[PDB]
Amino acid sequence: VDLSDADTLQRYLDQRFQQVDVSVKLELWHEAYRSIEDVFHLMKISKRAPKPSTLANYYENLVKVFFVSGDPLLHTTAWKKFYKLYSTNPRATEEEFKTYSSTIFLSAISTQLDEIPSIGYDPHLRMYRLLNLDAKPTRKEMLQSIIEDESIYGKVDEELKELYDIIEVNFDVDTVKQQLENLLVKLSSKTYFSQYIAPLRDVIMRRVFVAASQKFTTVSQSELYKLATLPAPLDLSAWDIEKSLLQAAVEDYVSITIDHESAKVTFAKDP
Amino acid sequence: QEDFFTRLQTIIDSRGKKTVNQQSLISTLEELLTVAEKPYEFIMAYLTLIPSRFDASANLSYQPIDQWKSSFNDISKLLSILDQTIDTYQVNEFADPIDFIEDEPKEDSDGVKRILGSIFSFVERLDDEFMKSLLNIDPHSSDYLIRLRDEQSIYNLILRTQLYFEATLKDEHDLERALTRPFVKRLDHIYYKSENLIKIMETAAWNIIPAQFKSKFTSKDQLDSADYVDNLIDGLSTILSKQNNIAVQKRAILYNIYYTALNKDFQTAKDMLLTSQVQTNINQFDSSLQILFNRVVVQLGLSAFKLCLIEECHQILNDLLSSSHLREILGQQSLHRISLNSSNNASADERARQCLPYHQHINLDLIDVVFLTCSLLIEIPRMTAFYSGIKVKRIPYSPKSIRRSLEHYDKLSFQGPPETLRDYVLFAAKSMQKGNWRDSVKYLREIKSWALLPNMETVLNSLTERVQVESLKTYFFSFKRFYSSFSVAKLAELFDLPENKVVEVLQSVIAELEIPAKLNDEKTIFVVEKGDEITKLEEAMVKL
């Protein structure tokens, strides 16, 4: 019975694996998620553990699913776990290693800023059961765990390390603008970049918003939009930028008042 | 003579015996039609031949296409014989007797409705068994399409039999009694279709009818007029208010409201409904007519929505669409699934007669998306107000509603890009909340259901507008906390709403909700942040 048991379990597990991969390739994300649950619990029960090809393709699917889910951390994690498995494969091209390391670092950059607390229960936390994560590895933790690892930092394209220098090495607003002018031209040449423009842009602009709230606390709006405006790929309609700020404000990063009668924005911090 | 009577009677007696070979009984009747020459022989042969077939296939799921197709041939042949006879088989009026040879059956009873009424019933079987096939075939197979091709030929027999009844019957009290039912069937076979398809069925029905005409509407002459179809419907409609059966009267009224709410203006339909006074009635008149009433409620809920009346729409549909079981309440459920449930078959006829064939179905996804779009436009600004800090207008607590499903989507561990239609509607709602109306329109146009409306472009832009308005409202409601002042010019440009609308909406809302907001029309600028609910409580504490 234990033989028939082990075999039937294996059948059912592979069955769910391809229900996941087919679902993802077929753009059904609910059946994909549900089948992924089914996979997780099965492996917890399973004695015989999966063959590496299937796990690699598993993370290959999980990266897409967690992309479109709106959670950058899980994305990043399954993308890492694809790396760790792919270094074992006989056909590995340096271009690919570079691409994937790069993309991991970007997904770390694209991550929304975890520093400002979330009041209440986040349902997304449950999903972390799936990847072994007990709680969210904050954008800091992600940056650390990424640059810490040899191969990852090692294979990253220079433009991206440069980006990390633009954003995270003593960031000053105007200087960041100027750096972005030159660096974006060199950056957009490479394939991986296409998908990350939006969350990246939002992160940048958030940083800009906070630095602007600290540096001058009462201003004309027309003066604010110039600073808030970014270069070519990150360009935004005026009101769109207004609402990026609005987002940041309702997120309680910056406590703001706005009087448009005089076209003024007033930052008052009285804590 | 006596050969014929004795044979026929032996057969009829043998039929009332349990063990019989029905194939052989049918074949015997037929082989004895071969011999018959005299017309009373023919007619009295057919009169027991038709039900002999129906009875033979009676205990099956339905009678198959071949046996049905040949029984049609039977009824059409009896009709051709009765037509070529021209009522002269009865020896006129003054002398009724059927005499030749009544002594052999000996069981004759004087009547017209009695001997010549049975005819209609035959036709009805043809129809009923026919429906039983459309329920039992696969909804998407080509076979279903062929059966539906047979529907027209049944409508033919309805009209023809009607016309023979008109020529024959000399007593108006009997003629009405006889005509009520085929008028009913005639209606059932028309109302759910387009004016075109109906006039097709009608034209086709009139082309197969010869020099015989007696009818009230007089269609043979007037066939081409555009007032034709409407006058047929309102004609039989007005007729059925005479009959004493209440289920028939309500039936008629409901067919009116359906057809009208489809091919005619909505207001007419509404007037009909409120004037017709059926409420305490409908509840007690069983299942099928309630399926019909829910069908017409749905239909006016739909056309009122085509008119871009949201407030009306949500008013209409809420009772029926709060039902979990709505698919069943609309009498659309696959027969098979409840065919296992309802067995035994004897009492299964009851539940199986309640569900409807496919071509008469109203796609549920269309209905649900419609109502949910409504409940969105309606409930979103009031919600936005409430949870962003203004509650003066809110005491809804919404049964089985868009808001509750919002509450359940927020609580999901996983949030996927929208796939099911309620998810697209959902994304449109959250989009409204954040104030991107463009995104919401995009997410709403990804819904497939909108393709089932012939006016779709019109309602696309109409909805785009109503959405522009309500999303402007929602925006204002949510963001008035961090804004002390606003610019009507910018707002107008960015929502793509001309200022006349903007100032109107905003002013009307602030005046209705008692919001501490001030507008200068001269400079077109707005003002807020005074407060509050709690500050009025501060004041109330301070005065006393």
mmCIF file of N, CA and C in Angstrom, chain A residues 27-30 33 65-66 68-71 121 123-127 221 225 239-240 242-243 246-247 249-250 252 254-261, chain B residues 410-419 424 431 433-436 475 478-479 481-487 490-491 494-495 520 523 525-527 529:
data_model
loop_
_atom_site.group_PDB
_atom_site.id
_atom_site.type_symbol
_atom_site.label_atom_id
_atom_site.label_comp_id
_atom_site.label_asym_id
_atom_site.label_seq_id
_atom_site.Cartn_x
_atom_site.Cartn_y
_atom_site.Cartn_z
ATOM 1 N N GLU A 27 -3.156 32.062 -18.593
ATOM 2 C CA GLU A 27 -3.619 33.320 -18.002
ATOM 3 C C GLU A 27 -4.902 33.150 -17.169
ATOM 4 N N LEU A 28 -4.979 32.042 -16.428
ATOM 5 C CA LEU A 28 -5.970 31.908 -15.359
ATOM 6 C C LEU A 28 -5.300 31.957 -13.993
ATOM 7 N N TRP A 29 -5.395 33.100 -13.332
ATOM 8 C CA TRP A 29 -4.573 33.321 -12.156
ATOM 9 C C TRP A 29 -5.210 32.773 -10.892
ATOM 10 N N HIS A 30 -6.524 32.599 -10.907
ATOM 11 C CA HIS A 30 -7.168 32.050 -9.732
ATOM 12 C C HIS A 30 -6.931 30.552 -9.662
ATOM 13 N N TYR A 33 -3.324 30.159 -8.602
ATOM 14 C CA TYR A 33 -3.109 30.301 -7.162
ATOM 15 C C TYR A 33 -3.628 29.101 -6.381
ATOM 16 N N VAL A 65 3.015 35.011 -11.547
ATOM 17 C CA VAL A 65 1.819 35.115 -10.709
ATOM 18 C C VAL A 65 1.963 36.194 -9.635
ATOM 19 N N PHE A 66 3.137 36.261 -9.015
ATOM 20 C CA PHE A 66 3.364 37.249 -7.971
ATOM 21 C C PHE A 66 3.708 38.605 -8.559
ATOM 22 N N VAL A 68 1.908 39.877 -11.317
ATOM 23 C CA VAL A 68 0.570 40.433 -11.500
ATOM 24 C C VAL A 68 -0.259 40.534 -10.218
ATOM 25 N N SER A 69 0.204 39.906 -9.143
ATOM 26 C CA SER A 69 -0.529 39.931 -7.878
ATOM 27 C C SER A 69 -0.462 41.305 -7.207
ATOM 28 N N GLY A 70 0.650 42.002 -7.414
ATOM 29 C CA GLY A 70 0.854 43.314 -6.827
ATOM 30 C C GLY A 70 1.719 43.268 -5.586
ATOM 31 N N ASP A 71 2.355 42.123 -5.364
ATOM 32 C CA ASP A 71 3.268 41.964 -4.240
ATOM 33 C C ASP A 71 4.675 41.696 -4.761
ATOM 34 N N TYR A 121 -4.626 44.215 9.777
ATOM 35 C CA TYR A 121 -4.186 42.909 9.312
ATOM 36 C C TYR A 121 -4.049 42.868 7.791
ATOM 37 N N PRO A 123 -3.962 40.622 4.663
ATOM 38 C CA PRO A 123 -4.241 39.253 4.220
ATOM 39 C C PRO A 123 -3.076 38.642 3.438
ATOM 40 N N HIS A 124 -2.331 39.480 2.728
ATOM 41 C CA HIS A 124 -1.197 39.025 1.924
ATOM 42 C C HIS A 124 -0.187 38.199 2.715
ATOM 43 N N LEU A 125 -0.087 38.477 4.010
ATOM 44 C CA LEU A 125 0.801 37.738 4.903
ATOM 45 C C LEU A 125 0.612 36.227 4.801
ATOM 46 N N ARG A 126 -0.635 35.784 4.639
ATOM 47 C CA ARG A 126 -0.913 34.348 4.568
ATOM 48 C C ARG A 126 -0.104 33.709 3.442
ATOM 49 N N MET A 127 -0.017 34.401 2.306
ATOM 50 C CA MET A 127 0.702 33.885 1.140
ATOM 51 C C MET A 127 2.158 33.562 1.455
ATOM 52 N N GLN A 221 2.415 75.743 -6.065
ATOM 53 C CA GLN A 221 2.247 74.436 -6.694
ATOM 54 C C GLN A 221 3.092 74.303 -7.956
ATOM 55 N N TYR A 225 5.604 71.133 -9.027
ATOM 56 C CA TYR A 225 5.524 70.246 -10.188
ATOM 57 C C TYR A 225 6.853 70.132 -10.948
ATOM 58 N N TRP A 239 -1.755 66.452 -13.475
ATOM 59 C CA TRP A 239 -2.705 65.984 -12.477
ATOM 60 C C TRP A 239 -2.350 64.568 -12.001
ATOM 61 N N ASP A 240 -1.738 63.777 -12.883
ATOM 62 C CA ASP A 240 -1.252 62.439 -12.522
ATOM 63 C C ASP A 240 -0.212 62.532 -11.404
ATOM 64 N N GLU A 242 0.096 65.172 -9.424
ATOM 65 C CA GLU A 242 -0.679 65.654 -8.287
ATOM 66 C C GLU A 242 -1.226 64.478 -7.487
ATOM 67 N N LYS A 243 -1.695 63.456 -8.197
ATOM 68 C CA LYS A 243 -2.301 62.311 -7.538
ATOM 69 C C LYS A 243 -1.255 61.325 -7.007
ATOM 70 N N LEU A 246 -0.832 62.886 -3.875
ATOM 71 C CA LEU A 246 -2.031 62.600 -3.097
ATOM 72 C C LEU A 246 -1.950 61.224 -2.457
ATOM 73 N N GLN A 247 -1.546 60.255 -3.267
ATOM 74 C CA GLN A 247 -1.292 58.904 -2.812
ATOM 75 C C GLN A 247 -0.366 58.957 -1.614
ATOM 76 N N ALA A 249 0.409 61.191 0.367
ATOM 77 C CA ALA A 249 -0.122 61.957 1.489
ATOM 78 C C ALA A 249 -1.150 61.163 2.281
ATOM 79 N N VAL A 250 -2.052 60.492 1.572
ATOM 80 C CA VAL A 250 -3.085 59.689 2.212
ATOM 81 C C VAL A 250 -2.431 58.472 2.859
ATOM 82 N N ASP A 252 -0.035 58.738 4.539
ATOM 83 C CA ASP A 252 0.422 59.347 5.789
ATOM 84 C C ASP A 252 1.939 59.424 5.897
ATOM 85 N N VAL A 254 3.564 62.011 4.409
ATOM 86 C CA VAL A 254 3.654 63.443 4.618
ATOM 87 C C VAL A 254 2.274 63.994 4.966
ATOM 88 N N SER A 255 2.195 64.730 6.072
ATOM 89 C CA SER A 255 0.954 65.388 6.464
ATOM 90 C C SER A 255 0.900 66.763 5.816
ATOM 91 N N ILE A 256 -0.081 66.951 4.936
ATOM 92 C CA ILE A 256 -0.124 68.109 4.048
ATOM 93 C C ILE A 256 -1.452 68.850 4.083
ATOM 94 N N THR A 257 -1.402 70.152 3.823
ATOM 95 C CA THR A 257 -2.611 70.903 3.509
ATOM 96 C C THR A 257 -2.364 71.613 2.178
ATOM 97 N N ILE A 258 -3.413 71.870 1.405
ATOM 98 C CA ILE A 258 -3.242 72.574 0.138
ATOM 99 C C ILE A 258 -4.297 73.652 -0.084
ATOM 100 N N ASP A 259 -3.844 74.884 -0.289
ATOM 101 C CA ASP A 259 -4.737 75.982 -0.653
ATOM 102 C C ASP A 259 -4.438 76.449 -2.079
ATOM 103 N N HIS A 260 -5.304 76.104 -3.025
ATOM 104 C CA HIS A 260 -5.047 76.378 -4.441
ATOM 105 C C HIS A 260 -5.501 77.774 -4.871
ATOM 106 N N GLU A 261 -6.253 78.437 -4.000
ATOM 107 C CA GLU A 261 -6.656 79.823 -4.217
ATOM 108 C C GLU A 261 -5.427 80.665 -4.539
ATOM 109 N N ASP B 410 -11.519 42.676 -0.524
ATOM 110 C CA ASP B 410 -10.450 43.275 0.260
ATOM 111 C C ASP B 410 -9.794 42.242 1.178
ATOM 112 N N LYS B 411 -10.583 41.271 1.631
ATOM 113 C CA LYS B 411 -10.135 40.313 2.639
ATOM 114 C C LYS B 411 -9.471 39.070 2.064
ATOM 115 N N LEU B 412 -9.333 39.013 0.745
ATOM 116 C CA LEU B 412 -8.680 37.873 0.110
ATOM 117 C C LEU B 412 -7.179 37.897 0.333
ATOM 118 N N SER B 413 -6.598 36.729 0.571
ATOM 119 C CA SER B 413 -5.156 36.631 0.708
ATOM 120 C C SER B 413 -4.509 37.060 -0.608
ATOM 121 N N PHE B 414 -5.142 36.673 -1.711
ATOM 122 C CA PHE B 414 -4.613 36.885 -3.057
ATOM 123 C C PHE B 414 -5.474 37.876 -3.828
ATOM 124 N N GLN B 415 -4.847 38.856 -4.472
ATOM 125 C CA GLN B 415 -5.586 39.741 -5.367
ATOM 126 C C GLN B 415 -5.054 39.624 -6.782
ATOM 127 N N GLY B 416 -5.838 39.010 -7.659
ATOM 128 C CA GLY B 416 -5.409 38.809 -9.028
ATOM 129 C C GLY B 416 -5.917 39.885 -9.960
ATOM 130 N N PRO B 417 -5.207 40.099 -11.076
ATOM 131 C CA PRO B 417 -5.747 40.959 -12.128
ATOM 132 C C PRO B 417 -7.063 40.359 -12.581
ATOM 133 N N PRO B 418 -8.078 41.197 -12.829
ATOM 134 C CA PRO B 418 -9.466 40.750 -13.006
ATOM 135 C C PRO B 418 -9.645 39.719 -14.121
ATOM 136 N N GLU B 419 -10.446 38.696 -13.842
ATOM 137 C CA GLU B 419 -10.751 37.676 -14.832
ATOM 138 C C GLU B 419 -12.258 37.487 -14.972
ATOM 139 N N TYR B 424 -13.846 42.639 -13.003
ATOM 140 C CA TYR B 424 -13.665 43.814 -13.855
ATOM 141 C C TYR B 424 -14.490 44.988 -13.314
ATOM 142 N N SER B 431 -10.930 51.884 -9.047
ATOM 143 C CA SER B 431 -10.490 52.958 -9.923
ATOM 144 C C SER B 431 -11.257 54.243 -9.620
ATOM 145 N N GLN B 433 -12.717 54.986 -6.827
ATOM 146 C CA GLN B 433 -12.246 55.383 -5.502
ATOM 147 C C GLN B 433 -10.979 56.231 -5.553
ATOM 148 N N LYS B 434 -9.986 55.771 -6.312
ATOM 149 C CA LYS B 434 -8.720 56.494 -6.415
ATOM 150 C C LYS B 434 -8.837 57.692 -7.352
ATOM 151 N N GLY B 435 -9.866 57.696 -8.193
ATOM 152 C CA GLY B 435 -10.124 58.850 -9.030
ATOM 153 C C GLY B 435 -9.622 58.767 -10.459
ATOM 154 N N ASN B 436 -9.194 57.590 -10.908
ATOM 155 C CA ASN B 436 -8.929 57.432 -12.334
ATOM 156 C C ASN B 436 -10.196 56.918 -12.995
ATOM 157 N N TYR B 475 -14.251 61.370 -6.232
ATOM 158 C CA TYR B 475 -12.994 62.092 -6.085
ATOM 159 C C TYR B 475 -13.127 63.191 -5.043
ATOM 160 N N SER B 478 -13.650 61.951 -1.384
ATOM 161 C CA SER B 478 -12.485 61.370 -0.737
ATOM 162 C C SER B 478 -11.392 62.398 -0.437
ATOM 163 N N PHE B 479 -11.150 63.314 -1.368
ATOM 164 C CA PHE B 479 -9.959 64.159 -1.271
ATOM 165 C C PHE B 479 -10.161 65.536 -0.631
ATOM 166 N N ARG B 481 -10.404 66.230 2.324
ATOM 167 C CA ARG B 481 -9.718 66.311 3.606
ATOM 168 C C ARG B 481 -8.431 67.126 3.493
ATOM 169 N N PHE B 482 -7.612 66.781 2.505
ATOM 170 C CA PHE B 482 -6.292 67.378 2.359
ATOM 171 C C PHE B 482 -6.267 68.597 1.427
ATOM 172 N N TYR B 483 -7.385 68.859 0.750
ATOM 173 C CA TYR B 483 -7.549 70.067 -0.072
ATOM 174 C C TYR B 483 -8.375 71.140 0.634
ATOM 175 N N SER B 484 -7.787 72.305 0.881
ATOM 176 C CA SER B 484 -8.590 73.440 1.324
ATOM 177 C C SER B 484 -9.240 74.196 0.153
ATOM 178 N N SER B 485 -8.615 74.176 -1.027
ATOM 179 C CA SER B 485 -9.145 74.920 -2.181
ATOM 180 C C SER B 485 -9.012 74.211 -3.538
ATOM 181 N N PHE B 486 -9.963 74.488 -4.432
ATOM 182 C CA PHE B 486 -10.067 73.809 -5.728
ATOM 183 C C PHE B 486 -10.259 74.746 -6.926
ATOM 184 N N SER B 487 -9.929 74.232 -8.107
ATOM 185 C CA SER B 487 -10.038 74.968 -9.365
ATOM 186 C C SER B 487 -10.977 74.279 -10.335
ATOM 187 N N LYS B 490 -9.416 73.310 -13.957
ATOM 188 C CA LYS B 490 -8.570 72.130 -13.965
ATOM 189 C C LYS B 490 -9.417 70.872 -13.827
ATOM 190 N N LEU B 491 -10.217 70.807 -12.762
ATOM 191 C CA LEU B 491 -11.138 69.695 -12.544
ATOM 192 C C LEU B 491 -11.970 69.405 -13.784
ATOM 193 N N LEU B 494 -9.808 67.853 -16.573
ATOM 194 C CA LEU B 494 -9.209 66.553 -16.267
ATOM 195 C C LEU B 494 -10.216 65.407 -16.143
ATOM 196 N N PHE B 495 -11.414 65.701 -15.650
ATOM 197 C CA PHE B 495 -12.471 64.699 -15.642
ATOM 198 C C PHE B 495 -13.165 64.638 -17.005
ATOM 199 N N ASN B 520 -16.986 80.230 -4.602
ATOM 200 C CA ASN B 520 -17.073 81.510 -5.288
ATOM 201 C C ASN B 520 -17.249 81.238 -6.779
ATOM 202 N N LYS B 523 -14.840 83.681 -9.168
ATOM 203 C CA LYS B 523 -13.491 83.209 -9.454
ATOM 204 C C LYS B 523 -13.455 81.696 -9.704
ATOM 205 N N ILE B 525 -13.892 79.006 -7.522
ATOM 206 C CA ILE B 525 -12.979 78.376 -6.554
ATOM 207 C C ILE B 525 -13.759 77.833 -5.341
ATOM 208 N N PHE B 526 -13.275 76.748 -4.734
ATOM 209 C CA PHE B 526 -13.998 76.060 -3.657
ATOM 210 C C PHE B 526 -13.176 75.998 -2.351
ATOM 211 N N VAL B 527 -13.833 75.885 -1.185
ATOM 212 C CA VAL B 527 -13.161 75.970 0.135
ATOM 213 C C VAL B 527 -13.691 74.968 1.192
ATOM 214 N N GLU B 529 -12.429 72.172 4.961
ATOM 215 C CA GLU B 529 -11.580 71.774 6.103
ATOM 216 C C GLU B 529 -11.978 72.381 7.461
#
